[PDB]
């Protein structure tokens, strides 16, 4: 992985040694070049994962997440450089450094072969993320949002640290390849019930699981746009990726420990979808949309079927691009009217016709219009949960209906109707804003032509 | 209700005729029944007792509710009509033209030359319009939404821009 | 019930402004200032929208789709009594005689 780790680090010298007026051009261009080379990770085999060294390996699960992560860095740079224009030069370079360091921790997190190396990097992403939210957020509440984000995560992570170290003691290793062959079954006992909880609660909080999700709408509403992009696109998927790996050693206890969390997700997804119908804040609506989508991922990981794992892998990638696009779309409105109130600026399709096309495409992927990968992921999950229990189609069906209602409600309220009279600073969409939107939707729609590369190890 | 008694009766008369028209459809039949309905209004036209007159209004409204057409006729461009707000998607505020690219403005040299005179006329008049509203408004703010006319020559009626320059009802 | 004298005067003044604004919306003769047989048209349409695509599709189907098993599957032709098989020359026997009731 050094062909990706090292050039990612070299982005830091590049940013700091760039001319004062070229920090965005240089960092954006060279982070796109790194994104290009990440496609070499798709040298995947039918039987064996791609194991580079004792430290790093890349299978079909981590490969698409790595490519999503490295694609997101250039997009985040494009999305931030407007609202950071008045920033002090050094504080602009420190902002970019926080994003580069986040990418560094992320690509190492997704390829760590040892679970305790995964834990440290998994935890290391907190610091740059927290600093972005609290230093470069705009509102007073960004400070409270930082604390909720920090302490929700740590409340779960610290038990996970104890469980992993206990697992290394008893099994002798935490290398994920070794665990595949040395895994022993988990037999019922209160001791194992809490080993199971410690291994899964840290990841449940990151997804987040319904009930434990309150940190997420706070963080999104306060984060800067680049922070919201990485939060929704990648950092949520650290929970999913971690769960997909650790469940290997939790069998067969996962048979009955899953029930309380499937119930929370199946019911929680209807509850958070319905919350979206009455949200007044556009960013908060998108945040609650992520909770509903990630509920499906939690259910799919817990029912442990080949179809559900394929569906979860596609959902994580599809959600990553769609939710990131939606936050970017809402941000472009915010940079004009400087409010997140959804009902404030209406009828924008009249004033920004092409940006209204992006709003349409983003909404269609969010409601999972076939054959988007949003629909492929969501459909595969629904097929597998139906076999788990037929009655789940009722809850899946209702969520699909409510998901369409709030997706098109967001489209209709902001883009259609009459424009707000007194709002007269809706300038024409910039090239930067249109290119940012297209760099989200075009790769998302292109992946429909070749969806096998985002279906994960069980394809 | 801020409507006087006279306004309520006249409003009820119009509304009753329109719902009568929906029932009758045919113009000759409507004319026959509109005259009988008018005769009923003329019957109590001179009722000088307000208490009885108000009582007559209550029963009349009660009768209208029972007899109203469940699906009355609506003018297409009237609220609830089939063409209400049909053209709002084509009405674009005039401030959108300040953002046009110069190459777009060069295509209409004469239109944008005139537009500048209006914008010039708007800046020059604004201060006097705010002043006129300051001098004519009693302490404690206005009590009605009525606005004054201009009192001198060269003055424009205060708050005129968004009435004068509003989009055409059939813009595109 | 009519307009008050104050109201009528304001409606008068707005009206002259509005009618002048509407008059100014008209385009001048030189505006916009732009910058610098059926058989044939249906013949060119058929060429570019039928012949060229059907060339591509036939090439696609003949030398790529049909070279793989079970890509194009036809319902087998109906065989009726008395039919002759082109491939072999086999003649299908006629049905047995009817009661010929009419």
């Amino acid at each position: 992985m050094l062909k990706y780790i090292i050039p990612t680090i070299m982005l830091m010298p590049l940013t700091w040694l760039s001319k004062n007026n070229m920090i965005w051009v240089n960092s954006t261009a060279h982070s796109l070049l790194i994104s290009f080379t990440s496609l070499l990770l798709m040298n995947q085999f039918g039987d064996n994962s791609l194991n580079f060294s004792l430290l790093f390996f890349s299978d079909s699960l981590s490969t698409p997440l790595l490519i999503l992560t490295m694609w997101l860095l250039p997009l985040m740079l494009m999305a931030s450089q407007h609202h950071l224009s008045k920033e002090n030069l050094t504080r602009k370079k420190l902002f970019i450094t926080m994003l580069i360091s986040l990418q560094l921790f992320l690509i190492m997190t997704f390829t760590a072969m040892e679970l305790i190396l995964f834990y440290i990097l998994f935890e290391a992403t907190l610091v740059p993320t927290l600093i972005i939210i609290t230093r470069w957020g705009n509102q007073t509440e960004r400070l409270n949002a930082g604390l909720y984000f920090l302490f929700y995560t740590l409340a779960g992570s610290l038990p996970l640290l104890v469980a992993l170290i206990y697992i290394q003691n008893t099994v002798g290793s935490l290398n994920f390849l070794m665990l595949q062959y040395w895994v022993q079954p988990v037999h019922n006992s209160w001791s194992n019930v809490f080993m199971w909880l410690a291994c899964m609660m840290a990841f449940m909080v990151k997804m987040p699981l319904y009930g434990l999700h309150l940190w997420l709408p706070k963080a999104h509403v306060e984060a800067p746009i680049a922070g919201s992009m990485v939060l929704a696109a990648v950092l949520l998927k650290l929970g999913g990726y971690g769960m997909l790996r650790i469940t290997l050693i939790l069998n067969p206890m996962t048979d009955f420990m899953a029930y309380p969390f499937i119930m929370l997700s199946l019911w929680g997804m209807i509850m958070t979808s319905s919350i979206c119908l009455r949200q007044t804040d556009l960013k908060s609506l998108i945040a609650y949309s992520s909770v509903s989508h990630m509920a499906l991922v939690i259910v799919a990981i817990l029912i442990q079927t080949p179809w559900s794992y394929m569906g979860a892998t596609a959902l994580m990638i599809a959600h990553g691009l769609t939710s990131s696009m939606l936050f970017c779309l809402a941000n472009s409105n915010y940079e004009r009217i400087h409010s997140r109130t959804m009902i404030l600026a209406r009828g924008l399709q009249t004033l920004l016709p092409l940006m209204a096309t992006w709003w349409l495409l983003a909404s269609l992927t969010n409601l999972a219009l076939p054959p988007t990968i949003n629909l492929i992921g969501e459909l595969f999950v629904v097929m597998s949960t139906f076999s788990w229990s037929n009655i789940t189609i009722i809850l899946m069906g209702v969520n699909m209906v409510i998901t369409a209602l709030y997706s098109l409600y967001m489209l209709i309220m902001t883009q259609r109707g009459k424009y707000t009279y007194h709002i007269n600073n809706i300038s024409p969409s910039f090239t930067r804003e249109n290119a940012l939107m297209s760099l989200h939707i075009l790769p998302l729609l292109l992946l429909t032509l070749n969806p096998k590369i985002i279906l994960g190890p069980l394809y | 209700a801020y409507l006087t008694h006279q306004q309520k009766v006249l409003r009820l008369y119009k509304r009753a005729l329109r719902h009568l028209e929906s029932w009758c459809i045919h113009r000759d039949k409507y004319r026959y029944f509109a005259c009988l309905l008018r005769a009923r209004f003329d019957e109590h036209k001179n009722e000088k007792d307000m208490v009885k007159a108000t009582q007559l209004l209550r029963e009349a409204e009660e009768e209208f509710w029972h007899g109203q057409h469940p699906q009355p006729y609506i003018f297409p461009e009237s609220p609830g009509g089939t063409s209400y707000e049909r053209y709002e998607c084509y009405k674009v505020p005039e401030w959108c033209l300040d953002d046009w690219h110069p190459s777009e403005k060069a295509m209409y040299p004469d239109y944008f030359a005139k537009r500048e005179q209006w914008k010039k006329l708007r800046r020059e008049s604004w201060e006097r319009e705010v002043k006129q509203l300051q001098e004519e408004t009693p302490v404690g703010g206005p009590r009605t939404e009525a606005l004054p006319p201009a009192r001198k020559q060269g003055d424009l009626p205060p708050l005129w821009w968004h009435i004068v320059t509003r989009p055409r009802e059939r813009p595109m | 019930s009519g307009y008050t004298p104050e109201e009528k005067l304001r409606l008068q003044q707005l009206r002259e402004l509005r009618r002048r604004w509407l008059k100014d919306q008209e385009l001048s003769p030189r505006e916009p200032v732009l910058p610098p047989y059926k058989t044939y048209r249906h013949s060119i349409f058929a060429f570019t929208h039928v012949l060229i695509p059907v060339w591509i599709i036939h090439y696609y189907l003949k030398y790529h789709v049909t070279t793989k098993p079970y890509t194009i599957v036809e319902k087998k032709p109906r065989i009726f009594p008395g039919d002759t098989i082109l491939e072999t020359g086999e003649v299908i026997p006629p049905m047995k005689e009817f009661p010929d009731q009419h």
Binding site: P353 | H101, P171 | E26
Partner: peptide, 12 residues
């Protein structure tokens, strides 16, 4: 009579 049609900028 051809009236001017007000539109948002299509240039960008």
């Amino acid at each position: 009579k051809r009236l001017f049609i007000i539109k948002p900028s299509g240039f960008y």
